[PDB]
Write a protein that binds this ligand. Structure first.
Ligand SMILES: Nc1nc2c(ncn2[C@@H]2O[C@H](COP(=O)(O)OP(=O)(O)O)[C@@H](O)[C@H]2O)c(=O)[nH]1
Ligand SMILES: [Mg+2]
Length: 179
């Protein structure tokens, strides 16, 4: 079996841990975990190709800026996340996440992921953003950002509804295998 390491980064609350936890065989309600603390492994076949992806979660706060790089050694693919209900989280993609990842993970492919796709048409989300004269991120904005940062691809998903989640991890596996 081919062994690859994946790291997920992005602002706190943008859905990183939930995205990884969709893959987990075992589930544990009413426990909030800042990061996946167990050795969670994704088993993905890509055209008769048994690949095991170790999934590494990260803490996005500024307080962890000096310890977060402990997660980066020997990474094979990055999931770089923002959330579609948070224009601020997209702004931090070029300003914080891209230079940090390119520095610690040189030449490692980046999948840019827009999380919480279910919230784009959600009435409450629309109202909360609208009161500050904001709106959910549009797909064209994610595509434009993937171009600016040189990402391998841009994909949208919802850990809540599960839409797009498979594609994220299958594309991350395809990315990890090119090197
Ligand atoms: N509506 C919706 N909420 C989500 C989704 N993913 C995560 N959440 C919620 O967003 C909050 C933060 O998620 P979490 O995975 O802990 O974010 P992290 O800080 O990036 O790890 C939690 O309350 C989740 O229930 C999603 O796809 N859709
Ligand atoms: Mg988390």
């Amino acid at each position: 079996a081919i062994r690859k390491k994946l790291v997920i980064v992005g602002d706190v609350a943008c859905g990183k841990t939930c995205l990884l936890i969709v893959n987990s065989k075992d589930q544990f309600p009413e426990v909030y975990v800042p990061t996946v603390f167990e050795n969670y492994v994704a088993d993905i076949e890509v055209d008769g190709k048994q690949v095991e992806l170790a999934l590494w979660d990260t803490a996005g706060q500024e307080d962890y800026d000096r310890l977060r790089p402990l997660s980066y050694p020997d990474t094979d693919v990055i999931l770089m996340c923002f959330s579609i209900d948070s224009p601020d989280s997209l702004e931090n993609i070029p300003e914080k996440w891209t230079p940090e990842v390119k520095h610690f993970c040189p030449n490692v492919p980046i999948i840019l992921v827009g999380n919480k796709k279910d919230l784009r048409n959600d009435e409450h989300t629309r109202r909360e953003l609208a009161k500050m004269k904001q709106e959910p991120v549009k797909p064209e904005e994610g595509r434009d950002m993937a171009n600016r940062i040189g990402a391998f691809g841009y994909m949208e998903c919802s850990a809540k509804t599960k839409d797009g989640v498979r594609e994220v991890f299958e594309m991350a596996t395809r990315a990890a295998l090119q090197a």
